[PDB]
Every structure is written in structure tokens, then in C-alpha cells.
């Protein structure tokens, strides 16, 4: 029965119990249920008034932590004689939560999530001699999945007639704005046992509803005579969180952002054949008090 | 009292005499889609006794070096009976499932089965960074075999797979397990040919062992869809 739990449950005193027909310590794991044996029923207890609050294991508090989701250093200079794969004072980022593994393993403790994303953008700069650090203006334009992303720093997609841009400087506090719950479903699919399209050559595991969009970030300034290395870090805090159907935590190291492929480490712990590091025997106690 | 059980759906019925208490997944029972959660505006077909009935898959042989078996739903039923015809002629489906898994042996056999229904079991491949293709996921009626069941073939852990709706078939205790699954999706209805929502996994945590005569022990899966709706009528693909 659903009830409101604010502190952990108390303990009642118990006495000697020697009754036939009543075996509270015997259970049936085959039913799929967890044991209902109380501490009052297994050993003889005292009355303990338990005042330990349970508010830090709330799913809101467990998940509303600002975690790093993106990180790009890109050279800020004159790019008239650079390569075809370089970031010419701008970058695009297909928004995911699967690149950095602390937030990934935490979100993948659930099958479905419904949350508002609070995005914090932290820009830092280094001189690529030393003459000082410029207070550069950056534009982070939110391009949805379906629109056109810019191909230049000075392209005309950056005018943002309808795309939401934020204009922020390096000397400012970090730029912060809230992205809503933007899924076409009622919850995001953290795991998607399916294929994204109607033909059989689609991508497995990537629900297109889960992807927020693109995050195109440029430097609005024109180039100086010297070059700079501008590092942009994006931090996401989930909020107003509903979570469904919790999952086993991932034990093996992640291989890719696109799938749940697994290799494991070479030896235990977190290996393919041994998740827990080994001991000598089942009757060997590793940290034994001498 | 919780060991005998008769599950009557449609023109089908299953009696079992060594059962456990059956499992309702997340405390939920299957229902039809209500009007305040409906999306598709056309009138759905509800072929009640024609589709809400047990369908029995092919039995798998339960051996010494078995790793485990998995069937993805509704992919294991998309070609069987009037459920499969309603799947192929419609765009949308919505149903719960009543999974009954059968496995019996003598009182001299030992072994334990983790019979677990996994929501949205996105699989992973081993020792590569290429995603699993279409033929590695959509095995159909026959289902698949676990490659590394200790990690549930997705880097997770078999040890923590009891967070999912599950039962056990311990041959000392019972010979059947029953899980009642509701609709489990972020969507009200879904395209059944490109998305699987429940994976029934059946895993040898304690292997089969005896010292009496070696008969074949099979494991049989009977799956009943429950509360099937279908929208988007067209031709069959």
C-alpha cells in the first residue's frame, strides 16, 4: 500500500516466541517476493525510536546533480588555412547523456525518465607568449533535430529568428537556462529495445524521441592576431523528475555511447567472468582482525 | 492453496499443481487504454477471445552447458494465430501478457531457473563496438540464447536482475512460474514489428543435475496476450 515515509521505521520490543505453525524466518524465494521477516521476528529486540530521515535517497535528490555532458576545446584563431575536420571557431553537439559515465550509469538505473533539463554552460580560455585573456562573447544556439545547423562561424543561421540562442561572456557567471521535457512520449526511453525506423537497416537502441536536439556554440567575436584555446563545458541538472522501472546497475565498463556493448576489464574486479575481485576460498576472510 | 492454479483465457486453460504464488508485474494488471490516455482517434479492434489466449512456443532442451534463453515480446508472437494476423494488418498494438513457464523433473533432480521478464532489454554485443543488428535481435518465435548471462548480455548484472518482475523455478519446490505483465511503454500504443517491450529471460542459475537416469528435461513457454487493442488498419506487409 502506498504511504508517505519521511523517516526510517521504528523497532518494537519483542519477547521469547515459541509458537507452532508460525515460521516468520522461513520464506519462499520462488514466489519472486522479498522476505518479509522482521527484526522483531528473528531476534529479540528493544524499542528504538528511529529518527533517521530518508530524504537524501529521493529520486529528485539522487538525480538533480549538475553533471558534465559535453566538453570541447576548440582553437579560436584565423581558420583560412586549416583542415576540413577542424572546429573553425564553432562546434555542433548532438545532445546526449551517454558520453560521460558517471551521469550515464546513474540515469541507466531506470527504464523511463521524465525530467526538465537545467543546462549550465561553462566556458574557459587559454592563450595558445602571454598577453592576457579576452572577454569573448559566445553564442549557444539550440537547434532542434530537424532544423539546419551552421557551417561557418559567420553563417546566417546564427541570426536565430526562431531558434533560441543565449549570448554570454567568459567573465560572466556561467550561462544557465532550462530545457523542458521535450519528448514526444510521456517519458524518455533510457533503454530502447527496438529499431528507429520502418526499414530493417535502422539503428538499434536509439529512440529518436530521446534526443533533445543540437547545441551549436560559436564565438561571436572575430579573430585576434593571436590564437586561443577555448574550452566549453556543458552541465546538465535533471529536475522535476519522475522515474520508472529500476534496472540492474552496469558493472562492466562502457565501450560506446551508441550501444550497451561490453568487453569488461582484463582481470577482476569488473571483468566479464568475474565482477567481484577474487579471494582464496569461500571460507577465507580477507579483512580479518588479528 | 497457492500451489494449485488454473489460468483460463479464451479457449485455453493451464492447470498446474506445483506453483508458487504468481507474479503481477509492479503490482499492475493489464487493462484496455482509457480515453484520457488515448492518442489514436480511430476506433480500435479488440479481438478478445481470438487473441487473448495462451500461445505455446517451442520447448528448449535444458542441459548441462545451458546458458539461458530469451524471447522478446511481442516479437515471439507476431506470426502466431489471430494475434499475429492482427499485428500484421494493423499499425498499432497495445497488450499485456500472461507468461507461464513450464519445467518439471523428478524429486532426484536439482536446478534453479531465474524466470525474469525484463522491460526494454536493449542488448549489447561482446568485444566489439558495432551495435547488434536486426537478425541478432529479432529472433522471432524461437528466441535466442544468452551469450553471457552473468551480465544479462548488456554489461549489467544477473545478480541484480531480481529488481525486474521475476519468479524462480526451483525443482525442489515448484515446476512452473507465472508472470502477469501490464503494458510497459512510454507510449500508449506502439508499432509491434520494430519495438520489443518485454524480454522473457530464463536462466540456469543452478544447473540441472541428478544421478538417476538422464531423461530430456525441456522448458516450455506459454504466453497469453491480455487486453489487446489494435489501431491503424491497413494491408499486411
Amino acid at each position: 500500500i502506498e504511504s508517505i515515509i519521511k523517516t526510517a521505521t521504528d523497532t518494537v520490543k519483542s519477547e521469547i516466541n515459541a509458537e507452532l505453525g508460525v515460521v516468520p524466518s522461513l520464506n519462499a524465494v520462488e514466489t519472486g517476493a522479498t522476505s518479509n521477516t522482521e527484526p522483531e521476528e528473528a531476534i529479540q529486540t528493544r524499542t528504538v525510536i528511529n529518527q533517521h530521515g530518508v530524504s537524501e535517497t529521493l529520486v529528485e535528490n539522487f538525480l538533480s546533480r549538475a553533471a558534465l555532458v559535453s566538453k570541447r576545446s576548440f582553437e579560436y584563431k584565423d581558420h583560412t588555412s586549416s583542415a576540413a575536420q577542424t572546429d573553425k571557431n564553432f562546434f555542433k553537439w548532438t545532445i546526449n547523456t551517454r558520453s560521460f559515465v558517471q551521469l550515464r550509469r546513474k540515469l541507466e538505473l531506470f527504464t523511463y525518465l521524465r525530467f526538465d533539463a537545467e543546462i549550465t554552460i561553462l566556458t574557459t580560455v587559454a592563450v595558445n607568449t602571454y598577453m592576457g585573456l579576452p572577454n569573448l562573447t559566445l553564442q549557444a544556439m539550440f537547434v532542434p533535430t530537424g532544423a539546419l545547423t551552421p557551417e561557418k562561424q559567420d553563417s546566417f543561421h546564427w541570426q536565430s529568428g526562431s531558434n533560441a540562442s543565449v549570448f554570454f561572456k567568459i567573465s560572466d557567471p556561467p550561462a544557465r537556462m532550462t530545457i523542458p521535457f521535450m519528448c514526444i512520449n510521456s517519458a524518455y526511453s533510457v533503454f530502447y529495445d527496438g529499431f528507429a525506423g520502418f526499414e530493417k537497416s535502422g539503428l538499434y537502441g536509439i529512440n529518436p524521441a530521446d534526443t533533445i536536439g543540437n547545441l551549436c556554440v560559436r564565438i561571436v567575436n572575430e579573430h585576434q592576431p593571436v590564437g586561443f584555446t577555448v574550452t566549453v563545458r556543458v552541465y546538465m541538472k535533471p529536475k522535476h523528475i519522475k522515474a520508472w522501472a529500476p534496472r540492474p546497475p552496469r558493472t562492466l565498463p562502457y565501450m560506446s555511447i551508441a550501444n550497451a556493448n561490453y568487453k569488461g576489464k582484463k582481470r577482476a574486479p569488473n571483468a566479464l567472468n568475474a565482477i567481484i575481485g577474487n579471494r582464496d576460498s569461500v571460507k577465507t576472510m580477507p579483512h580479518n582482525i588479528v | 492453496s497457492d500451489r494449485v492454479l488454473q489460468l483460463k483465457l479464451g479457449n485455453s486453460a493451464i492447470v498446474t499443481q506445483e506453483a508458487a504464488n504468481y507474479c503481477c508485474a509492479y503490482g499492475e494488471w493489464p487493462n484496455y487504454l482509457p480515453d484520457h490516455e488515448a492518442v489514436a482517434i480511430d476506433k480500435p479492434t479488440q479481438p478478445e477471445t481470438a487473441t487473448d489466449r495462451f500461445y505455446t512456443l517451442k520447448s528448449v532442451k535444458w542441459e548441462a552447458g545451458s546458458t539461458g534463453w530469451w524471447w522478446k515480446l511481442p516479437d515471439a508472437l507476431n506470426n502466431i494465430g489471430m494475434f499475429g494476423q492482427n499485428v500484421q494488418h494493423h499499425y498499432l498494438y497495445r497488450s499485456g501478457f500472461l507468461i507461464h513457464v513450464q519445467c518439471n523433473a523428478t524429486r532426484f533432480h536439482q536446478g534453479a531457473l531465474l524466470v525474469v521478464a525484463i522491460p526494454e532489454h536493449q542488448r549489447g554485443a561482446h568485444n566489439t563496438n558495432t551495435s547488434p543488428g536486426f537478425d541478432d535481435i529479432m529472433k522471432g518465435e524461437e528466441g535466442g540464447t544468452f551469450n553471457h548471462p552473468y551480465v544479462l548480455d548488456d554489461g549489467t548484472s544477473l545478480a541484480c536482475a531480481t529488481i525486474f518482475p521475476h519468479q524462480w523455478i526451483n525443482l525442489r519446490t515448484n515446476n512452473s512460474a507465472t508472470i502477469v505483465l501490464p503494458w510497459m511503454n512510454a507510449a500508449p500504443m506502439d508499432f509491434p514489428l520494430r519495438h520489443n517491450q518485454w524480454t522473457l529471460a530464463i536462466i540456469p542459475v543452478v544447473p540441472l543435475g541428478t544421478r538417476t537416469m538422464s531423461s530430456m528435461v525441456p522448458i516450455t513457454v506459454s504466453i497469453a496476450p491480455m487486453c489487446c487493442e489494435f489501431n491503424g488498419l491497413r494491408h499486411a506487409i
Partner: peptide, 29 residues
């Protein structure tokens, strides 16, 4: 919250309802 959108608000950390029996006692009896 001086913003006009309700998703702009701060984190809602006051939801103390539990139901462990949908995971610990999912049996019908």
C-alpha cells in the same frame, strides 16, 4: 519563480510517498 513557465521552477524535493510493495511483494496474495 518569476518566470512564466512552470518547468522553469526549482527542484521539487518534497515527494515522500513510497510503495516498496510494487517491487518487494509483487505477488497476488
Amino acid at each position: 519563480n518569476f518566470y512564466k513557465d512552470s518547468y522553469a521552477a526549482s527542484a521539487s524535493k518534497q515527494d515522500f510517498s513510497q510503495d516498496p510493495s510494487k517491487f518487494t511483494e509483487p505477488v497476488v496474495e
